[PDB]
Design a protein around this ligand. Structure first.
Ligand SMILES: Cc1cc(C)cc(Nc2nccc(-c3nc(C)c(C(=O)N[C@@H](C)CO)s3)n2)c1
Length: 255
C-alpha cells in the first residue's frame, strides 16, 4: 500500500462517476510522475487495482500501488499524451506507418493479456494511452475479469459498439471477444479517433451486424489493415482468430 509521499496537481486530467483523475508525483531520490484515480464503490476500485497488480507488460499501464487516504486512490505510471482517440483527433498528420506501429503495440499487450487469461472487456480507442507518438499502452481495467483456469470466457455499461455478438446475445466474454473490440479499435485508429457506428443505437448496431454488414474502410487505410479488421470482426467466435494470430499478422505487415 503506498504512503502519502505523493504530491497531487490541481487540474483534473479527467473525471467520472467514480471520482476524478489527477497528475501527481511519487517520491521513491528519483521521483516518478503518476496518474491517479481518486474516488469521490471502493470494491470496484480494489478490483481494478487487483487486476493491474498481476499484470506486467511494456504495453500495459503499470500500477504503482494503492494509496488509502482522504480518499481511495489508484496510482499508475503516467502515459503523458493521454487517450489514443483524442490524440488522433488532433494530429491528423500522423502517418499510416505510425498508426500501424501503435496498434501493433496494442495487439502485443493484448497478446499477453490472452496468455495470462484475462479479458479486458472495454478495449476501445479511449482506453489506449500514449506514452509517446511511438509508444502505446492499454488502460482502464475496471471491467476486466481474470478467467478461471477451467473456462474460456466469462459470463456476465456497456460499450455495445465494441462488443462481439456473443457478448450481446449470450453474455460470454473471452479473449476472442476482445479481438472483436480491437478490430473496432483499429477502425477508430485509422479514422483518427472518430466514433464508430455514428448516430446508431445499440440495437441498430446489433441489427446491422446480424445482416453481415461491417463498417467501411477508413480514408487512408492500407487494404491489408482493413482486411485484418474484417477478420477480427468474424461473427462466429469459434472461427475468429485469437490475439496470437492478430499479432502475427500485424508484426508481419509492419516489416
Ligand atoms: C485522463 C488522462 C489524461 C492524460 C493527458 C493522461 C492520462 N494518463 C494516464 N495514464 C495512465 C493511466 C491513466 C488513467 N487510467 C485510468 C484507468 C483512468 C481513468 O479512470 N479514466 C477515467 C476518467 C475514465 O473514466 S486515467 N491515465 C490520463
Amino acid at each position: 500500500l503506498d504512503r502519502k509521499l505523493l504530491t497531487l496537481e490541481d487540474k483534473e486530467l479527467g473525471s467520472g462517476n467514480f471520482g476524478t483523475v489527477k497528475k501527481g508525483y511519487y517520491q521513491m531520490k528519483v521521483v516518478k510522475t503518476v496518474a491517479v484515480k481518486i474516488l469521490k464503490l471502493k470494491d470496484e476500485l480494489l478490483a481494478e487495482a487487483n487486476v493491474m497488480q498481476q499484470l506486467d507488460n511494456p504495453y500495459i499501464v503499470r500500477m504503482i500501488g494503492i494509496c488509502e487516504a482522504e480518499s481511495w486512490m489508484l496510482v499508475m505510471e503516467m502515459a503523458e499524451l493521454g487517450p489514443l482517440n483524442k490524440y488522433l483527433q488532433q494530429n491528423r498528420h500522423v502517418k499510416d506507418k505510425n498508426i500501424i506501429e501503435l496498434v501493433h503495440q496494442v495487439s502485443m499487450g493484448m497478446k499477453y493479456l490472452e496468455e495470462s487469461n484475462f479479458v479486458h472487456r472495454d478495449l476501445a480507442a479511449r482506453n489506449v494511452l500514449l506514452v509517446t507518438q511511438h509508444y502505446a499502452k492499454i488502460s482502464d481495467f475496471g471491467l476486466s475479469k481474470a478467467l478461471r483456469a477451467d473456462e474460456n470466457y466469462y459470463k456476465a455499461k456497456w460499450p455495445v459498439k465494441w462488443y462481439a455478438p456473443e457478448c450481446i446475445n449470450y453474455y460470454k466474454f473471452s479473449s476472442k471477444s476482445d479481438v472483436w473490440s480491437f478490430g473496432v479499435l483499429m477502425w477508430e485508429a485509422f479514422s483518427y479517433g472518430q466514433k464508430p457506428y455514428r448516430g446508431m443505437k445499440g440495437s441498430e448496431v446489433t441489427a446491422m451486424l446480424e445482416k453481415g454488414e461491417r463498417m467501411g474502410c477508413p480514408a487512408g487505410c492500407p487494404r491489408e489493415m482493413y482486411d485484418l479488421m474484417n477478420l477480427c470482426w468474424t461473427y462466429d467466435v469459434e472461427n475468429r482468430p485469437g490475439f496470437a494470430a492478430v499479432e502475427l499478422r500485424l508484426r508481419n505487415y509492419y516489416y
